[PDB]
Design a protein around this nucleic acid. Structure first.
Ligand SMILES: CCOCCOCCOCCO
Length: 132
DNA sequence: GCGAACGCG
DNA sequence: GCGAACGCG
């Protein structure tokens, strides 16, 4: 069950696809540790993907040993694969999110990390803390 | 809508 | 064995 000294992340979208953001919070406190400026077009899974990787980079900067919780099978897998498999068309209106996703892929393939990435078990625990 | 997890040849 | 037909915001 829950490791409380941990960071939780979640994505939110106005439309899917649409404007997406994300945040990370302290799983115990609910303290908002970071939040990303709105991105004009993205998907839920892209947003999540950026969120996990932001967290990874947040924690590593700080030499944290805390784990990250995510409720996304997909984003978790993409992170473990160091490869994002989004179906989102690449055009003028999606270049920003795709630049962001590629760079985070790049980061994952050019760096190591200690952080355990753990499934937030929603049926048992409720809404992950980082939900909007 | 996003992406992962039965029937054919 | 291969390809078509859940959890979360
Ligand atoms: C300026 C406060 O430091 C925040 C550290 O987080 C850095 C995250 O880097 C961007 C990851 O995509």
């Amino acid at each position: 069950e829950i490791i409380w000294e941990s960071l939780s992340v979640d994505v939110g979208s106005q439309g899917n696809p649409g404007i997406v953001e994300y945040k990370g919070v302290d799983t115990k406190t609910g303290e908002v540790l970071f939040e990303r400026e709105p991105i004009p077009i993205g998907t839920n899974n892209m947003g999540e993907f950026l969120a996990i990787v932001h967290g990874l980079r947040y924690l590593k900067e700080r030499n944290s040993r805390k784990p990250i919780y995510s409720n996304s099978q997909t984003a978790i897998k993409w992170v473990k694969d160091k490869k994002a498999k989004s179906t989102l068309v690449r055009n003028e209106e999606t270049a920003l999110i795709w630049k962001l996703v590629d760079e985070a892929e790049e980061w994952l393939n050019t760096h190591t990390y200690e952080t355990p990435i753990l499934k937030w078990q929603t049926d048992k625990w409720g809404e992950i803390k980082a939900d909007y």
